[PDB]
Amino acid sequence: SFSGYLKLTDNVYIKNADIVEEAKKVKPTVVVNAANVYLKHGGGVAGALNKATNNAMQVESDDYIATNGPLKVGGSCVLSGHNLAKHCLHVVGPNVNKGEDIQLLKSAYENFNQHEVLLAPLLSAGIFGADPIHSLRVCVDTVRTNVYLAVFDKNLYDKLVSSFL
Numbered sequence: 592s593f594s595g596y597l598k599l600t601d602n603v604y605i606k607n608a609d610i611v612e613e614a615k616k617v618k619p620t621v622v623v624n625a626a627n628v629y630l631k632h633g634g635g636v637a638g639a640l641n642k643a644t645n646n647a648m649q650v651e652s653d654d655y656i657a658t659n660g661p662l663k664v665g666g667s668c669v670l671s672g673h674n675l676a677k678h679c680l681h682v683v684g685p686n687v688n689k690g691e692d693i694q695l696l697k698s699a700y701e702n703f704n705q706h707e708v709l710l711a712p713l714l715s716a717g718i719f720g721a722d723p724i725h726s727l728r729v730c731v732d733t734v735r736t737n738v739y740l741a742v743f744d745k746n747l748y749d750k751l752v753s754s755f756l
């Protein structure tokens with residue numbers, strides 16, 4: 592199971608880890624991808640997860656989009672986890688670098704409540720432009736299921752833990 596995590600609350604745990612490496616090690620039931628509405632996994636966590644699947648995640652995602660159309664900002668879809676997890680929950684947090692409503696971050700985290708346990712990144716953090724301290728606060732105030740947060744950057748991980756209220 593998950594190891595080396597710091598417990599933040601009853602159900603939220605955090606670790607300084609590469610989510611790709613964490614997924615390959617644990618093979619969780621659900622890994623969360625920091626997806627965009629088109630499921631175009633170009634960079635950040637999405638590019639890293641997709642590259643770990645040898646692009647199988649992108650091939651599956653393009654078929655999903657061709658059939659269903661784009662996701663909503665704040666929405667999600669469950670696809671295969673490929674070599675990383677049983678499933679991948681592609682969650683679309685608002686991209687503040689695209690001027691998207693930061694208020695949609697709570698709706699994005701609500702998707703996690705449909706899964707008993709998840710390995711996840713902080714939504715809308717990194718290349719999505721939101722404040723990761725704000726993302727962690729929305730996560731602990733929204734997610735009720737067991738979420739194991741992987742934070743890639745050690746310096747950000749320390750800032751998140753040291754400032755956690």
Ligand SMILES: CCc1c(C(=O)NC)[nH]c(C)c1C(C)=O
Pocket residue numbers: 609610611612634635636638639640642643743
């Ligand atoms: C492609 C770079 C990458 C990897 C990786 O390739 N791990 C094996 N994991 C992560 C989380 C990244 C990021 C944040 O972009």
